DNA sequence: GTCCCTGTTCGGGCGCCG
DNA sequence: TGGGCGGCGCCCGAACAGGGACTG
């Protein structure tokens, strides 16, 4: 039936008018299904016939529904949606099974004809006008308008969610010991009551929904495990994801790689160790959903590993709030991280990955910090608590990094875990110049118009070196100068540069970079035993800087 | 009777998403909002109000009492003609000169005054739920909200009537209202000052934080003193003086720069010549003078820059234009061995903002040396003021840190 | 001013839920 | 033929913004 709840007042945007769009042609199949739906809806007051006094129309169609021979009626309200007012969306996230607590008794209900039981604002109905055709040259046309929430309108999901909440409010208020997870029209209902008392309370809930116009058909009333919910199978002590099937394509298209990566991301919540870096790389230069992409050998390897991962039986458990949350992180290659969240050693609540690349030049300590913050926020959403961390980084490494690093950084309570690969800094810069170590003054210059450049060094021991470069820039040539000095110096060296750019990259101790040249610089820096880097202002006649400056300038006028 | 409030011309209301809350803050907000709804201070709304402002909760120190805090920064930006121009409050230059300034939370007063009905939609906020058990529950204010620039503006006339007798009787105490608080300053001795404060409270029956702004001095730029100078030392000195001359144009460098001629080892020692010695002493002197041509512009916004100097030390500068500092200073802490950079940084932001409110009646816009996600994950764990400044996230250039270090 | 480099935001594919 | 709506997620690339270095 139709809920007696007040309607939500809804407006068009200022100066706009309802949609006037012709109706498409439709299959005989879809026409028959739509007339069968609309005669029943008009009989039930959910839609009303309209005449020439309504100057509006929007195309209608239908699609098969998930697990039925039944049809869903849709309206291409894109035009009305563009002209309809903004809403504030109340669905703030997707509930997750690992945030559920064990319950003695569990029920899942599905509200019948959910949208079509919530009434629509009296003043807004004329705009929902549509029409069913008999055939392009057969008959006039059905020509109804909506009295309830239609499927296709941008306003229907929020208005339904808010209405369902208003309706559940008194029941929640007088049943604090029953938990109702409310996602759009599906209700998970858990309690610690004995099966008899729980079923009486369920019947109360269903009668209460009826009083507000909402049916819960028995065909969709789940009463025994496993419960089907939000994409999972809920058993009494564990949950699983309904099966993830990956494509087995021979040729691969961009759309296919999107589908593959998307299923892998969905699987990574419970299946541990999923990686998608190489598969994702396959998307960089693309320009069409239909472009065929050949898998690199690295992508081949990654995909095979993910397949073998997915052939394993896996399950999650439920949250016990009287125990600690523990998040454990493992480094994988190439800016990828896996984690498991659990409360008892080998019993994961869930798993996850973090592989977002941030920064031209970064290191493993920055990435690990980013992963800790992501896991923290995700945990606050799911459980309202921050987890205790088990991390593969030494307390000393973290102390050194936070001491020497000039940005505020912080990581909540954590304990070290000694399973490699460990997270280390691979070199330290000295805080003071090194006695005895040769002092290299480096510089580089580049011609803005010709792109030619020079890089080189002068040392306090008399050594000079200049190399010419093509297709370069000032910043590249300053990095070249530093690299040159690192290559040519002994295990201990002092380096004086005038480029804030290069100083800034190197003081942050990167261990990986998007630039091949910075990677070469990093390999050299790791080979050294002591490195002291110093900065002087350019073009001030300072020290050895002036001599190198003159040396690398035959492309500065 | 309500006061009609308009938005700035051409601007819409705030549409700011709600960030995740811990369970205990959600529980506190749900308690607080049940009480507020019952009292008529707020009402449930639905999704056809398109506006949203984030909400969270803070705990008073040594208290078990949670406080609801609404981040009205966007709404404040979008009503800025109303509260700054139409119904503004002037700022007294003597407040910063007093022996003692006490801060009094007067926010409750606003809940007695009704808010204009056309404007209530803009005050919408949304309470979230653990693990998205439920869609968000939405409310809007029916009364002047704490944290809105419009509330002290509208309540100005009542506050002036309330303070007229006390001001008349105590004419050397200055009282300045900023947003939720009264700043009450006097030159009394601390014993008699406190009684005068716990005299104004009795009056205001129609906590407190103690401040001594007459002792707020400026952090001068200073140069190293050493009896043995290396090539490295002098290179560092010349670089720093070179940067400093963008502020003090009298800084001269050539006599020190001349000591570095040639291609020398960083560690080799260099005696300072008489010329260079005198140049250095003259530079030391120049740094002690006030910066020339710094005039506060009350129309433009304040910029506050912060640097982490390490080991619990922070430096900060308040300016409106580059190299023209209105204030510099530091924020120091003992070596804690359980040090929290985020907590220290929010404490520093609050101290700096307090100082700006006392000196200019203005909070500054902060350039914060932290990743956005770290700060957004943890700052509300340590916040204790009712106001919130604007801020943005910066990667401090290492040289700049080097220049203001102590 | 111009050029180089780097970081943020946002839309537009796909995945999952309903 | 599929075709509509809201939510969250991931990854990429285009569009900007901001700051350092440079030209004559
Ligand atoms: N692709 C979709 C799927 C669903 N929805 C909306 C949201 C939930 C509501 C359910 O309506 P509904 O008539 O009860 O349909 P259901 O499939 O739940 O069937 P039921 O009545 O329980 O047999 O529809 C949508 O807009 N687009
Ligand atoms: Mg249904
Ligand atoms: Mg140079």
PDB file of N, CA and C (backbone and C1' of nucleotides) and ligand atoms in Angstrom, chain A residues 442-445 478 498-499 538-539 545 549 552, chain D residues 21-22, ligand 3:
ATOM      1  N   UNK A 442      79.171  22.091  -6.852  1.00  0.00           N
ATOM      2  CA  UNK A 442      78.506  21.671  -8.086  1.00  0.00           C
ATOM      3  C   UNK A 442      77.599  22.777  -8.610  1.00  0.00           C
ATOM      4  N   UNK A 443      77.383  22.759  -9.920  1.00  0.00           N
ATOM      5  CA  UNK A 443      76.394  23.640 -10.519  1.00  0.00           C
ATOM      6  C   UNK A 443      76.038  23.087 -11.887  1.00  0.00           C
ATOM      7  N   UNK A 444      74.973  23.645 -12.447  1.00  0.00           N
ATOM      8  CA  UNK A 444      74.563  23.334 -13.801  1.00  0.00           C
ATOM      9  C   UNK A 444      73.780  24.498 -14.355  1.00  0.00           C
ATOM     10  N   UNK A 445      73.872  24.684 -15.666  1.00  0.00           N
ATOM     11  CA  UNK A 445      73.142  25.728 -16.368  1.00  0.00           C
ATOM     12  C   UNK A 445      72.465  25.137 -17.596  1.00  0.00           C
ATOM     13  N   UNK A 478      70.951  20.671 -12.508  1.00  0.00           N
ATOM     14  CA  UNK A 478      71.428  20.704 -11.122  1.00  0.00           C
ATOM     15  C   UNK A 478      71.485  19.296 -10.513  1.00  0.00           C
ATOM     16  N   UNK A 498      73.732  25.252  -5.199  1.00  0.00           N
ATOM     17  CA  UNK A 498      72.940  26.470  -5.090  1.00  0.00           C
ATOM     18  C   UNK A 498      71.467  26.251  -5.421  1.00  0.00           C
ATOM     19  N   UNK A 499      71.052  25.020  -5.691  1.00  0.00           N
ATOM     20  CA  UNK A 499      69.678  24.748  -6.105  1.00  0.00           C
ATOM     21  C   UNK A 499      68.851  24.276  -4.902  1.00  0.00           C
ATOM     22  N   UNK A 538      72.881  31.402  -4.997  1.00  0.00           N
ATOM     23  CA  UNK A 538      73.465  31.495  -6.326  1.00  0.00           C
ATOM     24  C   UNK A 538      73.751  32.946  -6.715  1.00  0.00           C
ATOM     25  N   UNK A 539      74.788  33.126  -7.541  1.00  0.00           N
ATOM     26  CA  UNK A 539      75.112  34.407  -8.163  1.00  0.00           C
ATOM     27  C   UNK A 539      75.522  35.463  -7.146  1.00  0.00           C
ATOM     28  N   UNK A 545      81.393  28.049  -5.479  1.00  0.00           N
ATOM     29  CA  UNK A 545      80.207  28.215  -6.307  1.00  0.00           C
ATOM     30  C   UNK A 545      80.478  29.128  -7.498  1.00  0.00           C
ATOM     31  N   UNK A 549      80.090  28.005 -11.382  1.00  0.00           N
ATOM     32  CA  UNK A 549      79.123  28.798 -12.130  1.00  0.00           C
ATOM     33  C   UNK A 549      79.724  29.276 -13.445  1.00  0.00           C
ATOM     34  N   UNK A 552      80.188  26.134 -15.923  1.00  0.00           N
ATOM     35  CA  UNK A 552      79.051  25.536 -16.622  1.00  0.00           C
ATOM     36  C   UNK A 552      78.288  26.563 -17.454  1.00  0.00           C
TER      37      UNK A 552
ATOM     38  P    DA D  21      65.780  29.361  -6.537  1.00  0.00           P
ATOM     39  O5'  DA D  21      65.905  29.599  -8.102  1.00  0.00           O
ATOM     40  C5'  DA D  21      66.078  28.497  -8.940  1.00  0.00           C
ATOM     41  C4'  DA D  21      66.094  28.943 -10.367  1.00  0.00           C
ATOM     42  C3'  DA D  21      67.012  30.131 -10.642  1.00  0.00           C
ATOM     43  O3'  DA D  21      67.813  29.842 -11.760  1.00  0.00           O
ATOM     44  C1'  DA D  21      64.831  30.548 -11.474  1.00  0.00           C
ATOM     45  P    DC D  22      69.053  30.782 -12.160  1.00  0.00           P
ATOM     46  O5'  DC D  22      68.560  31.463 -13.509  1.00  0.00           O
ATOM     47  C5'  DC D  22      68.016  30.661 -14.542  1.00  0.00           C
ATOM     48  C4'  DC D  22      67.124  31.489 -15.446  1.00  0.00           C
ATOM     49  C3'  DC D  22      67.771  32.758 -16.037  1.00  0.00           C
ATOM     50  O3'  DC D  22      67.762  32.689 -17.463  1.00  0.00           O
ATOM     51  C1'  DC D  22      65.590  33.186 -15.232  1.00  0.00           C
TER      52       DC D  22
HETATM   53 MG1  LIG E   3      73.179  27.406 -10.583  1.00  0.00          MG
END
